Structure formats: structure tokens, C-alpha cells
Amino acid sequence: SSTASALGKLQDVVNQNAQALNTLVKQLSSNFGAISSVLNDILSRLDPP
Amino acid sequence: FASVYAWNRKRISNCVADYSVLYNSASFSTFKCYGVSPTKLNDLCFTNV
């Protein structure tokens, strides 16, 4: 009860999973060399070619 | 109109214009526009000119 940090394995697993998911969802906002990071603007501003 | 060495710059803002009325009349120069496609200029609401 009094002493904490006795469950390092479970916390490490949970933190690894959450960090991986967060990095995946954050990678969605990159530009990847295009002219915009959102496709709705691209389809509403450019030509199909 | 001034020379190329003294090209005239001006600001256009706070108005409401249209481009199809100018686009359809094939009278002024020739249109080749990057970024926004010429035919889709009217529908979007960019800040100023």
C-alpha cells in the first residue's frame, strides 16, 4: 500500500502501447511533400491531373 | 502602366468580386493559373489579393 512503483512491468506495457498509438495518430498531420496536409482542401482547390 | 523596373503593386480587399464573368469572356490575355484551378476560384474564400 504505502510503497508505489512496484508494478513497473504493467505500467511499461501500457505506456508503450499508448505512446505507439499516439505517434501513429500524430503522424497523420504531416505534409509528406505535398502542398497541404488535408485532402479535402486538395480536392477542393486543384485539378485531377 | 509603369515599366517592369517600376511595377505597380496594389492591395485588393474588403470587396466581393467574381472571376467567371471575366473568365468566360475570352478577351483579356490568356489564363494559366497555378495553385487554385481557374474554374474553382469563385467557390473558395481566400483572404485578400
Side-chain angles (χ1 to χ4, degrees):
Chain A
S1 159
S2 309
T3 293
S5 81
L7 278 79
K9 296 180 182 180
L10 295 174
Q11 212 62 43
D12 196 3
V13 161
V14 170
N15 281 116
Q16 278 164 96
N17 198 350
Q19 188 274 331
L21 208 63
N22 194 1
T23 295
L24 168 62
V25 73
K26 181 191 299 318
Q27 198 42 250
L28 193 49
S29 174
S30 185
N31 205 5
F32 280 110
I35 56 190
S36 295
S37 172
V38 65
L39 59 86
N40 286 115
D41 195 3
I42 297 304
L43 57 92
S44 159
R45 229 190 62 188
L46 273 298
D47 289 316
Chain B
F1 280 107
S3 307
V4 55
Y5 172 67
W7 47 271
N8 303 142
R9 150 181 297 275
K10 65 175 70 176
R11 179 75 63 90
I12 313 178
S13 166
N14 283 118
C15 61
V16 172
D18 190 273
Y19 292 165
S20 194
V21 288
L22 162 69
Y23 182 76
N24 58 4
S25 87
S27 43
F28 195 76
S29 304
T30 304
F31 266 51
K32 180 255 297 182
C33 309
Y34 292 165
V36 183
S37 66
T39 187
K40 221 171 264 181
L41 280 161
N42 300 315
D43 311 331
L44 60 84
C45 202
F46 63 89
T47 61
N48 53 1
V49 189

